[PDB]
Design a protein around this nucleic acid. Structure first.
Lengths: 119, 163
RNA sequence: UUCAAACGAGGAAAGGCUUACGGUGGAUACCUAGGCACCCAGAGACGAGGAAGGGCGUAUUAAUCGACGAAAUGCUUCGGGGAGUUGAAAAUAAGCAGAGAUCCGGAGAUUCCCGAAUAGGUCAACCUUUCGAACUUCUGCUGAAUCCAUGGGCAGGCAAGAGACAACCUGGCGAACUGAAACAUCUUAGUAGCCAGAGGAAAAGAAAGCAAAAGCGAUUCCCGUAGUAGCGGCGAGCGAAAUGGGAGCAGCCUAGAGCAAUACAAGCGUCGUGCUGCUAGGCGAAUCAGUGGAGUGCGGAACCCUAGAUGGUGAAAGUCCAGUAGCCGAAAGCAUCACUAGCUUAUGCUCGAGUAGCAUGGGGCACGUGGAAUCCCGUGUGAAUCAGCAAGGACCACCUUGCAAGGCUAAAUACUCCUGGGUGACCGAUAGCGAAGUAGUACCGUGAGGGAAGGGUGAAAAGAACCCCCAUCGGGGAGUGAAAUAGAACAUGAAACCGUAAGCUCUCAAGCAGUGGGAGGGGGACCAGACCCUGACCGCGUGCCUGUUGAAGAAUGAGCCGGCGACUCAUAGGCAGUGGCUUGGUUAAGGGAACCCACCGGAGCCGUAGCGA
RNA sequence: GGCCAGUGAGACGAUGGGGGAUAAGCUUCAUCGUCGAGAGGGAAACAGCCCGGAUCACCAGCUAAGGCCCCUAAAUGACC
RNA sequence: CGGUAGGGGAGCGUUCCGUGUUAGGGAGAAACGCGUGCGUGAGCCGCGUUGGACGAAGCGGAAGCGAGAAUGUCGGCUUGAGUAACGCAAACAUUGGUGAGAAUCCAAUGCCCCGAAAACCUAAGGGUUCCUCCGCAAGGUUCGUCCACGGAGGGUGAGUCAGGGCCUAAGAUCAGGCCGAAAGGCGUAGUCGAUGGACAACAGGUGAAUAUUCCUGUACUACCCCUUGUUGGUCCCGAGG
RNA sequence: GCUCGAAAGACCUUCAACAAAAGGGUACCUGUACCCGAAACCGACACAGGUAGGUAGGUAGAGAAUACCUAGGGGCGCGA
RNA sequence: GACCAGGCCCGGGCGACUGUUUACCAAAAACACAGGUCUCCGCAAAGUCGUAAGACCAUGUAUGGGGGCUGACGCCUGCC
RNA sequence: UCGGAGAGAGGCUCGGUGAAAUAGACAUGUCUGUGAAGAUGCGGACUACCUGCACCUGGACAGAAAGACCCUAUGAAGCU
RNA sequence: UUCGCCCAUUAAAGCGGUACGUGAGCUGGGUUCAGAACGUCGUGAGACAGUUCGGUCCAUAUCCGGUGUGGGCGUUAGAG
């Protein structure tokens, strides 16, 4: 059955898959199949890294402080630290706000003396 | 009339496969594959004649709105029976010069002045259809917003579309 | 400035990524005097007075084709018509021509060899006598075996025997695969296929029919009646008829004398006349100036038009050209209708005549014998014969109807090689017929037979003098053109693939390697405001699809790319959505002054009352 | 009740019983759940075991199972 | 609001057509990039470059409606690759000529192989591949001024050779006729078909290519006609051979 | 083909037959180039495969064996 | 003395032998062969080819021919 | 049995011409364990500069072959 | 035939895994390819984990993994 002639139609269905493939190391950007198995990866992993992006930092923040705990005095855990604020009443200074360690370590030094007084 | 290849494998030749066993090539023959060129065709349009059977009372009342929605607006009106006399066309260009729309706004010129015969002078013009005052379908009538009639044609439209 | 320790960019044979510039190659978009279908109107035939199909030749050199044929791409005659003529792929050379030099059409002459061919033979287009095939019908002349008579033979006048025939049609003979979810019944096909004959229509056809005691009443074709009834391992499956509505629609011959073949009609011809068609042909309207390489484009204005169908001309006009509406023409040669004529048959009225079954074994009717006939037969026999016989799906009686044993018969109905016009929401050279450019060729096989690839530079080619390098292959310039970043691989020319240049990453780092976080570097930013492109390193992390309870794999399919490639169509039935009408609704065939498939047609089907064998 | 389906060789774990030596992710039944037609977190890596069963974004918190020396976030925390 | 097979509910795009010689286009489709804005998505819109012609907005209608796999089909293009191979082991080289270049061309001096053979002649087949003058991209699995490559000319002249022509075997066909559903088979007179049989010369020379055919010297057979002598001849034959 | 005989049927001073000049005329039509156990044949190619007949020398030897030499034909077409 | 130019003997299974054959892996104690025997036909044969005709078989003819098994020869070939 | 040496045709290098089976994609190390349970690409760990040539040649259930073995499908083709 | 038995030694003259190591190495002798024959089974075609004779199993390999040998670069001022 003489189709309606794919012509340019089936031409756009492949090049569009190539435009997306313009930053890959391997030859997964110069073939519909090599990219077919490539896009799916960036089609599944993408659906993951999007939710993993939050977890990826969940360990970071804790690690950021962890490296800052092995110097002060509370060699115990940063948990007791969080416990102090919890039992206290500070809904601030979150895992993200833990950036006070690196820059201006003078502010993060105050809470260090406020956690001991509470507990 | 999109006649295609009905009996695919049944073309100018026939199916004559090769020794299909321990070779490597696809297990199949040549010609009329039809996947392979120079062969027949599996599916394809056949001599069709799509002609739905319509009733009668469903058409009469379906063509009444045609002239109804026309006379409602400000389109061309009727004329007279003396329009069948004029055997020439120039007498028409001068006539349509009075009613208006000379450069022909578009294909809006559904003419239906005559009754017995056709206006061989009104068919020459680019945009204009000479339909006989009898089976005025919804197609042509709305095909051209502008439509002109007469004192006679309007009568015949009362015989069918009416009692 | 000297010794050690802790670190360290810079460096690449090559490579990866992004980007720029090309090659290979080829698709797509676009356009095609050609195919694929169909409608209307014609043509359905040629041919031993020698064909289809070919070989060998022919023009001024001239291989291949289109014709023709050694009066060989030309001749004779008439006509139309109008000028150029020597066909085409390539000019040129040498000319014929301005009231018959070509071309177009009809009527004739010519038409080697081979092929029915018909001289014999034959690896066809060759050979050898020679003007001769062999048969059917008729006539004459001869004439065996035994007196006649024949047989046989000879001669002459016709026809027949050929197309190795495209479909339709009649007749003879005659499967399987497959269906019956197994398969020998059955069905599937009495199709395909083989063979014979004729017409262009054939076949069939005015009825010992059907129905029925109402009446119709030739055959064939179409739509219904029922795809019911019936038939069948009543399984598969196949499939009536009566009747009704339409297209079409006329009925006649053969089957002892006298006066006697005059009248009335039907079927034809040697030829010719007329109407209407076919094969050449003629008449056939209308504007400019401005932008652009060019305009038939746009803007202003005007004109023709029963002809703005269409196409072409260097890009969309109806007004440039060829045509188109309409109006005319054809010394002749012909088809189909009428009117008149050689010859044979055929013809009126009256009074008659009027052509013999079944049992068994088969086929065909929807019917595979079953209660189930009838029709056509192989074989053995074989009555009556119109105050007689047959048919009414066993038979019988009654009644009714019809009476064949010999034949002919237009139209409605079928199909198509081919012809002319036109149409088609058919395709467009990996499409469509295998063939839209000298392919069913070139090639493969002994052969039957099988069976491609390959499209367009531009409007006109002005398709590239000369100059420079080389072996006087090839290229670059100079020029032509609006373009050759169009030039003979040439249009628009992507992808797979193959390279150069530039930025970044890249030797102590490994696992379908991307992704998230993410430094540095080469650039681009904003009169900071921390962003847009590459990416060290880091956390995770075993293609897709198919088939499976279950795989990433040692489960399988796939080298890449372009194109191409798999539930469409017809009829019918049952539902859902929706629409018109409504216990009513709705047609099929056909007719049709049909811009139009309306109107008419309601023959027929479905539903509201059912149930029961 | 009506229209269109799909699928009839499933596997595994816990539990209650036939087969085998109560040997097998073996085979044959019943029941529940999972896989099979739902990831992910955890058992190093193991679909069928456990938790929980994914409309989506988010450098947002708190939890389940499983854990908290380092390697991948988290107690070499206290008492016996 | 995970989702296979499946069921149900909504849309985009492609070719064409109706609504369209309305409108957009040579101040210009198609092919590629970009704006990475927009929609749930397949995509759409605008635009630069290149390029050369038309294409087509909206709704609906009719579709041969978009595949990276069916050991698919057609064509082109990678990789193993530039690894193997360059095809009996009868080695080769040199001095010169010509040419842009030649170990393999030509010419000369030799080596080496074969020697009933990789000599010549002839039949079948092939069929112009023979000769000469030039050219070479392609064909010669190296080049090539070489070639049985390509493009132009030239060349096969016998009554005695051979094939036709007489005759004939296996065998084929085959008037009339005998048979067979049609077709056709078989088969005789007769008529075809061979590797069979039947009349007739060679030796030299000549040409770039032919020669028992051209030329020279020397001969032969058969038929018809004519002259002379003698004698009786005579069919699809009998007999001998 | 040739020779001879043919109820001497037909012919019958004829036409013919044999021979002689081994006179004269005539003897029409085709192929015949090249190769041919060869690379132009048959096998897809210039694949050492296969393929009838004829002529066929010197020396050693029984021998168209074999080896070495004639005439003649080649070194087989990628090299170092 | 080069080229050229049988390896020999002994015992044993089977087939007498020569020959033929699975043309492109088996050629063998396979097959074939003569010998012997059984059986059918006096015939236009049986029988084979063919729907037929016709024809092969034999223009011979039962010391013929056709079909089957066996199958050189030597000793033999039982019972049912 | 322990084979060695030498002479030729290839192999190796260079110059000219110039293939293939096959292949989803590559930055295709080993080992233990695990895994529809004998994978380099999973997990842990060890080892390891990047890139050729020649050669030996186990892995990639390598390549060619939808196997001629078995079974299945009320398949087919012959034979008795 | 692995094995085993036998003759003759050694200090002793081991077992087992490695898809019963090893055919992308040879051998392929045995054994489910086609031939043939004996015995047996069936009327027969054939059949039988009985025996006997004969009976073509390829490949210049990229990578992984090895036997060896190089081309660059990095150890940093450049080299021996």
């Amino acid at each position: 059955m003489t189709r309606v002639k794919r012509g340019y139609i089936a031409r756009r269905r492949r090049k569009k898959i190539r435009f997306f493939a313009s930053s890959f190391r391997g030859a997964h950007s110069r073939l519909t199949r090599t990219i077919a198995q490539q896009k799916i990866r960036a089609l599944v992993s993408a659906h993951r890294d999007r939710d993993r992006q939050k977890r990826d930092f969940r360990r970071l923040w804790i690690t950021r402080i962890n490296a800052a705990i092995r110097e002060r005095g509370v060699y115990y855990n940063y948990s007791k630290f969080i416990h102090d604020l919890y039992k206290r009443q500070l809904l601030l200074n979150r895992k993200i706000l833990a950036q006070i360690a690196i820059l201006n370590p003078n502010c993060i030094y105050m809470i260090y003396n406020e956690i001991i007084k509470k507990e | 009339t999109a006649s295609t290849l009905t009996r695919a494998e049944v073309r100018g030749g026939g199916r004559k496969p090769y020794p299909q066993k321990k070779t490597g090539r696809a297990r199949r023959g040549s010609q009329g594959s039809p996947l392979r060129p120079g062969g027949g065709v599996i599916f394809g349009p056949k001599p069709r004649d799509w002609t739905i059977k319509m009733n009668k009372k469903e058409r009469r009342l379906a063509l009444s709105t045609a002239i109804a929605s026309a006379v409602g607006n400000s389109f061309v009106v009727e004329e007279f029976a003396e329009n069948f006399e004029k055997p020439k066309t120039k007498d028409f260009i001068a006539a349509m010069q009075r009613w208006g729309l000379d450069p022909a706004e578009k294909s809006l010129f559904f003419l239906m002045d005559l009754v017995e015969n056709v206006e061989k002078s009104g068919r020459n013009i680019r945009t204009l259809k000479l339909l006989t005052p009898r089976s005025l379908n919804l197609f042509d009538v709305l095909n051209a917003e502008k439509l002109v009639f007469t004192e006679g044609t309007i009568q015949y439209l009362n015989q069918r579309y009416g009692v």
